[PDB]
Amino acid sequence: NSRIHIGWMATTLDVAENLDRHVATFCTRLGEFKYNFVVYPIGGVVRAFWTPNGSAENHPPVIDLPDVQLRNDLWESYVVGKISPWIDCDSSDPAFASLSEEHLLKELSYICYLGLQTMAIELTRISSPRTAAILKKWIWTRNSRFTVWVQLPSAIEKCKDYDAFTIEHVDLWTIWADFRKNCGNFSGVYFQVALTISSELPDELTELKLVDRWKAEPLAAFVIESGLFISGRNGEASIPSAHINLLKHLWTTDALRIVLRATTDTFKYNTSIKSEYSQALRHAVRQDQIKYDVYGEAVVGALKDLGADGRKTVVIYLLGGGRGPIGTKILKSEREYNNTFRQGQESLKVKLYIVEKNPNAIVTLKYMNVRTWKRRVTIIESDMRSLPGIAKDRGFEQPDIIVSELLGSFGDNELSPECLDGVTGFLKPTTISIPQKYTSYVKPIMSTHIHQTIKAQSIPYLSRAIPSHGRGEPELDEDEMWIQKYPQGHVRNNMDQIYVVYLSKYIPLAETTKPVFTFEHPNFMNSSNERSDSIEFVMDRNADLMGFAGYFDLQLYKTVMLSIEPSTHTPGMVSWFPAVIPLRDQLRVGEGDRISLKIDRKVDNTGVWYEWHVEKKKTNGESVSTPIQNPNGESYYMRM
Amino acid sequence: ANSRIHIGWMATTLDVAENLDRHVATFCTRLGEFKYNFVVYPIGGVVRAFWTPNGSAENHPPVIDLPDVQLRNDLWESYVVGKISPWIDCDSSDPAFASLSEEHLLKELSYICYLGLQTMAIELTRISSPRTAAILKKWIWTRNSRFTVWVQLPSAIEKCKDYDAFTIEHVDLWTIWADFRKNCGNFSGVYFQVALTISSELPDELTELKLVDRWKAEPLAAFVIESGLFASIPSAHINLLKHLWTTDALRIVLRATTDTFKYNTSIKSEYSQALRHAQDQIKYDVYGEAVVGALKDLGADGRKTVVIYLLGGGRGPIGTKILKSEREYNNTFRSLKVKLYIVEKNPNAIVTLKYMNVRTWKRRVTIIESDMRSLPGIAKDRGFEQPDIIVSELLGSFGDNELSPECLDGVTGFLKPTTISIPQKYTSYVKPIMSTHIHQTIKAQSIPYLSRAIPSHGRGEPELDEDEMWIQKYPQGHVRNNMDQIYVVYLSKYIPLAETTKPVFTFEHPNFMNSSNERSDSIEFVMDRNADLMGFAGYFDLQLYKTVMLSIEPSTHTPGMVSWFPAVIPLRDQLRVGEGDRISLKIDRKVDNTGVWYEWHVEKKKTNGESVSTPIQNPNGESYYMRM
């Protein structure tokens, strides 16, 4: 059995209680019934199996399949995410089709969020144009790779759009081939088709000349219905000779998974025949905690500066909660605080509002807030930059502390200052903000490896539509295919970007690094987040300067602070690797030369970018200057 | 431990035995018995490598004579690190000698490529080596092979040819390396690497920490170790060798410098040790059968000697087959001696045909290094004779796809009327196919940065860009260039949309009436199911002589063969077909003043009579042009 993997597809048949919540024990039992992976409705069963035939008042159930309830690698191995069956972008009713595009998008996004390795999407028509368009752009513009099982219908007659008066030369294959075309013929290594076998075997599945086609197609799975008998021996549940001859016929490798599909309202042998189908089928074809702790210490100190006043209750806001180890952490910090400061007296109580934008994150936050946090915290869905309005509107009180962790390796690269800055109008002049300050540093380095590696990045055909890091977005070319173009040229584009690298085969040209860009919150005065500076060094040898290695340190609160800079590196911390500001071309230097790194941090109505370059000066005062790189963030432009 | 560290032996005039260029295996067996795996051996051979020009034009270089046959290609591939003849100074102050040096640096690179070497070393003898750098540059950038290169350095700046202590302002071994590295385009340090040469007196920049750290940021590949010690190693030597030894992928070569020879041969080992303390049988067969057949036919006449021209010896197996088939005729049917003429143009192969004509043929065959196209003229100047038979093999997986007809039509010049061509004839075939996998795979072909300068398969050739970097432009588009080419593939995940092939282009030799090689045929095919036609599997058959013959065609396929995988004439986009569809594969085989190409496409006509047509693929050989 080691070689055959048998997926069990969720159905409206095994919808237990809170199944969405207890996926773990689910795959546990199922697994006990000798089968490994499962095809589960990604959105959750309370959503997957919702019925859309209601009034204008019947809206779809929000997504509710928590990640936390199962460690990631497990999600990746077992669960195969499938799109809610009620979704129908090619509906005959415009409104429902639009709705379906919207929610199809939502479920795609969530599948990415859970990080599944495989996905199912089941076609219900002979033509699914809109579905095609959506799916096509999706897959073509993702920066990752994942697999896709397009499960087909049992036969043509099951198709919503089937008129027995117009199916001239159509069949299941024609359907698949048509969808495959329509999504732009993405590599069958990742874009695959799943057949659905039932009781009645179509002719094109038995007539050799037709089952032959499926060999020249990315076949990934057979989806098999419980449409079968119990003939032989102790009523051995088995499978017809044409069925057998088929599965056998098309079983080319043991990577071709097989999903069993519950059609029959059989509670089985009281849930025992599952393994029987298993066998029948089988023998037919044979984490960075340090950062978090530091945050905790910061918090406790903060509660100590105010708690001393003999406070009672205090308003804390977590800005961008993620999955929230910082929420759990904050709470634990209130507990430790009370456990060591308020001994034999009135405890201090902290109220915790967590603000977040990503709806999947929210999905995790509610689960956390139920299981661990015990309904303590108020979850708020918005980007912090919109809080002020809905805060006092919906009746919430201004915070005392606002905790955030929006740091990039170069400090402000990940838009921290703009995010935190957007929430100033709703704070007390009293509001202490963590982190309080952070500063971005830099130090000249030399490596043929880092440079040569940055420069020689290339974009394979299959990655031709992946969106650029600059101001450009993918588009449609003449062949109606998505392409991310690069007018500035590929090399240019490669070199005008900050990067995040594990510095290995390099060497410093300065003994120590210099300060570049500092930021302090709360920014009550609203100073411009955009900056512009020179950072000069001195070379003491004949060397090739490939650019600068960027860092940052950061004070959460007063004494409490963590740092990535080499001289003061939080021991054992891995939460950040250094940034790299590369030069287009290795710049040569010798003993004596002074190097003026010109870096401007420019801000836009819609984004934020760095424009940098270098000025070399020998001792004779004579000076040169490399070209201004990343002019207008055309190659590197962090948007908002 | 021990085997973790790899030690190599650099050859030197210090160890020039006799006939050595024709005895390498034993050399490295001896070298191995002294405990050191790889070796650095000049590729032209010693006779060539250590030649010293100081005279007039009288002294021309010792021809490359390091034959491949002496060693099976994986032995070479495993142990022999190739190195360029030290005498080659591409940057000579004497114009003539620099030109000569370019020519031979080329011959030599070509040979490294020939023997199939996995690594190769090149000694920088100057502070600035610009011409060398240009040649090397264009070379590595236009190679579709992925091989390694060690740029070996001088002991110290002081001993460079262009060394002048008057403008050696701020120059150093590293400034040198970085200059050269910059001058070859900064080819990935994963292939283009530098070797340090540790002399007896230790330079400043290999001791001064701050300086020595430079090499940790460079593609350090090997340490060249001069025999300038006592078997011991001085303090600074040790501290350096450790200091820059970061990986165990590093290699270290022994440089025979001081000892005229090691007093105790065991010392040759004391050094290494001390440092560590830091195929298609059937094609040929069938040919021999057709040959014995031809000697039956022509021999029966009554003569006692026949002259045959092998036009393209290669490494000559077809030759040893001619002479092992003449050897085996004089007993079954008879005498009838056979005089063999093996013509060949590949200058590196000629080495193999000499070492072969010596170690095998007992000089009974006259090798001839000339394009088999101007042989008619060199047929008298060198006192040759008209051929009774000419044995050739210039066919590809699509038959005529390698240009057989044109070159044979070149030999047509001096042929007797009685000359039978082996092979006499061929014809090409074609079979409609369906496979996402293949089509997707062809379309997805991408050129990464390091392959930006590989030449196209068409009329185009590489060119310098705005950064003086070699680039192969594809103005018709990457995808179009991808789909307008014939390929050879192992049909992996596909299906046939026909039951039997069909004829395309035939060719008849000797093409005596000199008929045009330009062809233009239209093939017809009917479809029997709902399918996606992606293109055509391409095939061929060839008759060598009367009865005997060989073919790659589906049904009539020479069994057990691996001599030719099938071709694919793909379409730009898959064609949807259904029951009863008429398909015209329209193929014109056009020929040019300098090359030959295909212009193909497909016409579809349904049961109803509607006629559409795919676009003309490969117009004017733009994506596909076999040059002549």
Curated annotation (Swiss-Prot), chain A:
GO terms for cellular component: cytosol; nucleus; transcription repressor complex. A protein binds at residues 405, 414. Keywords: Apoptosis, Chromatin regulator, DNA damage, Methyltransferase, Nucleus, S-adenosyl-L-methionine, Transcription, Transcription regulation, Transferase. Residues 435-640 are annotated as: Beta barrel. Residues 1-285 are annotated as: TIM barrel. Residues 447-495 are annotated as: Dimerization. The active site is at 405 (proton donor/acceptor), 414 (proton donor/acceptor). GO terms for biological process: intrinsic apoptotic signaling pathway in response to DNA damage; locomotory behavior; methylation; negative regulation of DNA damage response, signal transduction by p53 class mediator; negative regulation of DNA-templated transcription; regulation of DNA-templated transcription; response to odorant. It is found in: Nucleus. It catalyses: L-arginyl-[protein] + 2 S-adenosyl-L-methionine = N(omega),N(omega)'-dimethyl-L-arginyl-[protein] + 2 S-adenosyl-L-homocysteine + 2 H(+). S-adenosyl-L-methionine binds at residues 291-292, 356, 383-384. Residues 287-612 form the SAM-dependent MTase PRMT-type domain. The keyword DNA damage applies. Belongs to the class I-like SAM-binding methyltransferase superfamily. Protein arginine N-methyltransferase family. Homodimer. Interacts with cep-1 (via C-terminus domain); does not methylate cep-1. Interacts with cbp-1 (via N-terminus domain and HAT domain); the interaction results in methylation of cbp-1. Component of a complex that contains cep-1 and cbp-1. May interact with pid-2, pid-4 and pid-5. Catalyzes the symmetrical dimethylation of arginine residues in targets such as small nuclear ribonucleoproteins, histone H2A/H4 and cbp-1. Dimethylation occurs in a distributive manner where the protein is released after the addition of the first methyl group prior to rebinding for the addition of the second methyl group. Plays a role in the negative regulation of DNA damage-induced apoptosis. By methylating cbp-1, may prevent apoptosis by repressing the capacity of cbp-1 to enhance cep-1 dependent transcription activation of the programmed cell death activator egl-1. This is Protein arginine N-methyltransferase 5.
